[PDB]
């Protein structure tokens, strides 16, 4: 989801 990208580590 969008939030999975947001929270993910770089």
């Amino acid at each position, epitope marked *: 989801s969008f*939030e999975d990208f947001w929270k993910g580590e*770089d």
Partner: nanobody, 115 residues
Framework: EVQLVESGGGLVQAGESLRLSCAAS????????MGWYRQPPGKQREGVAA???????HYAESVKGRFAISKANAKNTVYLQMNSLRPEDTAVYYC?????????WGQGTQVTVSS
């Protein structure tokens, strides 16, 4: 005590382009990720685009290809290019940044697209 300053918004004609700007402020520390969410009137808030410090970026499906997010040369500053704007793009646009493990949200700036 990070402060977000959003600029560039306003009331625009369908089919025109608009660039939003967001500068995260009050930190010497680079963000991990930074981006934009938007809230159409009466609807839930949804992510629009995000970019990580590496330059890796992510677009929601509803805007993918139509919007473009990028890092400004300035510390903790990103741009949203909004091209070919349509009335369905009308929304409060919110900047958000994650710095040292904490999320911070801007107050939001209106983008309104007449038909």
């Amino acid at each position: 005590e990070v402060q977000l300053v959003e600029s560039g918004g306003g009331l625009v004609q369908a089919g025109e382009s608009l660039r939003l700007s967001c500068a995260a402020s009050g930190s010497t520390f680079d963000f991990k990720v930074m981006g934009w969410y938007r809230q159409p009137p009466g609807k839930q808030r949804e992510g629009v685009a995000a970019i990580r410090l590496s330059g890796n970026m992510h677009y929601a499906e509803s805007v993918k290809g139509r919007f473009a997010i990028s890092k400004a040369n300035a510390k903790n500053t990103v741009y949203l290019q909004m091209n070919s704007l349509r009335p369905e793009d009308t929304a409060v646009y919110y900047c958000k940044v994650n710095i040292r493990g904490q999320d911070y949200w801007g107050q939001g700036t209106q983008v309104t697209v007449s038909s």
